[PDB]
Short mmCIF file of C-alpha atoms and ligand atoms in Angstrom, two decimals:
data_model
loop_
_atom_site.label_atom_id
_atom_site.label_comp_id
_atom_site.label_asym_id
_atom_site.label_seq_id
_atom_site.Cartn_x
_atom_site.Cartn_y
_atom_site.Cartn_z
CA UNK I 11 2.46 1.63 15.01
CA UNK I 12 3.72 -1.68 16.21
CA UNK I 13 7.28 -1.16 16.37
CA UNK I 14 6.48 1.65 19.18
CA UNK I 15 4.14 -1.25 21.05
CA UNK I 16 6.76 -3.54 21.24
CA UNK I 17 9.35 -3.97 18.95
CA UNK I 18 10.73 -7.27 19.82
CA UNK I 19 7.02 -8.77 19.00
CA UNK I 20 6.65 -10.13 22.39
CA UNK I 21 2.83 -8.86 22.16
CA UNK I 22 2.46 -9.72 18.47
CA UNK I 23 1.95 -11.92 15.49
CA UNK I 24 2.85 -10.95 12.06
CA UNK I 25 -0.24 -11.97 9.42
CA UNK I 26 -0.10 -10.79 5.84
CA UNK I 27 -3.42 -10.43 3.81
CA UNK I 28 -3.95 -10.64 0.11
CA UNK I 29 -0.79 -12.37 -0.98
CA UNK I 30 -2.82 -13.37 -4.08
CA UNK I 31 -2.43 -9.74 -5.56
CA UNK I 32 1.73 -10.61 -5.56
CA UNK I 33 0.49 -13.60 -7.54
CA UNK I 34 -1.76 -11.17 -9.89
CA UNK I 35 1.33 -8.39 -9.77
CA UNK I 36 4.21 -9.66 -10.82
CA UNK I 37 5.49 -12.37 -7.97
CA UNK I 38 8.65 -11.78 -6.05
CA UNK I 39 9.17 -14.76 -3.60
CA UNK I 40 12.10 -13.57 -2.66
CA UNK I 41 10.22 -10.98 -0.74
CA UNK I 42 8.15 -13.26 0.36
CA UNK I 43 10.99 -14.86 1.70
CA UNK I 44 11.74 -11.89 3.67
CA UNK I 45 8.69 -11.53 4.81
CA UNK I 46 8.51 -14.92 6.81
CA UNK I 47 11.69 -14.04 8.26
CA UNK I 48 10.85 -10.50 9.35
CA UNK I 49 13.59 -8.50 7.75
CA UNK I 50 11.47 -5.79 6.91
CA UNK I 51 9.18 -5.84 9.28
CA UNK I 52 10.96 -4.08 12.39
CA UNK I 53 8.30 -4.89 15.33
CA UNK I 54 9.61 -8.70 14.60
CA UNK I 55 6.72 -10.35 15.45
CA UNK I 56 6.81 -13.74 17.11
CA UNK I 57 5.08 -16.58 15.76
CA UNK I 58 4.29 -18.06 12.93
CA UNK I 59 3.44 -15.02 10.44
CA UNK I 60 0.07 -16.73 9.09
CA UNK I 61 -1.36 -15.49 5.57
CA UNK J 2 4.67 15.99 0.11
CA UNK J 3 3.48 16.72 -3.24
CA UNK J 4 0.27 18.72 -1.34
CA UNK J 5 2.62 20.81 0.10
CA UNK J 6 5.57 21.30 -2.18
CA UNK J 7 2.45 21.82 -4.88
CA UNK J 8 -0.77 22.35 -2.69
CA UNK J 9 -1.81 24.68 -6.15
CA UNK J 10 -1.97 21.32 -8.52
CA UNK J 11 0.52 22.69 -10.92
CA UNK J 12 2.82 20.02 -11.29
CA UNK J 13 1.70 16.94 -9.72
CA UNK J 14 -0.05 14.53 -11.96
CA UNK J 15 -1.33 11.34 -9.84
CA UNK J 16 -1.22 7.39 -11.55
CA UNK J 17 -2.97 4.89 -10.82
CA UNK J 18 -1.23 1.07 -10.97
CA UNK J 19 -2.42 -2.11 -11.46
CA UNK J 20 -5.83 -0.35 -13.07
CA UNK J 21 -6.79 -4.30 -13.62
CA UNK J 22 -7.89 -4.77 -9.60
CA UNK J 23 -10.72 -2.18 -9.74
CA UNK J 24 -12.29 -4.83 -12.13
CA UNK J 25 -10.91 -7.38 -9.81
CA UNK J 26 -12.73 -5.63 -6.79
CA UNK J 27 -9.39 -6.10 -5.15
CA UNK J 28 -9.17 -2.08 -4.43
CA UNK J 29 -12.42 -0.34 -3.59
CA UNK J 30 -13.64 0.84 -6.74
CA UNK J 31 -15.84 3.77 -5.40
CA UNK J 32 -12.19 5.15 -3.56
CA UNK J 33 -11.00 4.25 -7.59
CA UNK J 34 -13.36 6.25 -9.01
CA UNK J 35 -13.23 9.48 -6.42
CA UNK J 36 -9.52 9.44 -6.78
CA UNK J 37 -10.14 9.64 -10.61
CA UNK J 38 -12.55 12.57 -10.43
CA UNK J 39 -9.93 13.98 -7.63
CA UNK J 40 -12.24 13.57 -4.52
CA UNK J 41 -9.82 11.75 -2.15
CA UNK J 42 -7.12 14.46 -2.92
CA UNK J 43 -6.30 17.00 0.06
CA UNK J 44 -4.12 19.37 -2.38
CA UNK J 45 -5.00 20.42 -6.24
CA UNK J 46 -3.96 18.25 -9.02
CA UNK J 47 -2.62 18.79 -12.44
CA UNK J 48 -4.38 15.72 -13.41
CA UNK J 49 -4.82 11.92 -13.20
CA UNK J 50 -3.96 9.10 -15.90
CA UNK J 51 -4.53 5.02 -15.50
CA UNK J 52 -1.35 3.18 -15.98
K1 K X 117 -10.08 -2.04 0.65
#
């Protein structure tokens, strides 16, 4: 949806909601890792990606 | 896919994950329970199991 708005994420901010439920799955930091960098997130959002 | 490679729900049985957040209230429970009794399904089902 994003991506096709702007994918260099000039007109967004990345936010993630719920990252207690990795902490109640199994946790993978690594992907969490990921996530604060954007890798697989391809609108790459600018800002701080806030939880 | 699977409602239209088996929109006659002979062959696709549908599982529910991390069954423990419906206690949790972390996934809607009434969206929990239709999905169990097949409600939420656009296609037929073989069936549905907890994991
Ligand atoms: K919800």
């Amino acid at each position: 949806l994003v991506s096709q708005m702007d994918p260099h994420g000039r007109r967004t901010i990345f936010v993630l909601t719920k990252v207690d439920l990795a902490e109640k799955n199994v946790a993978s930091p690594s992907r969490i890792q990921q996530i604060i960098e954007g890798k697989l997130f391809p609108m790459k959002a600018l800002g701080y990606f806030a939880v």
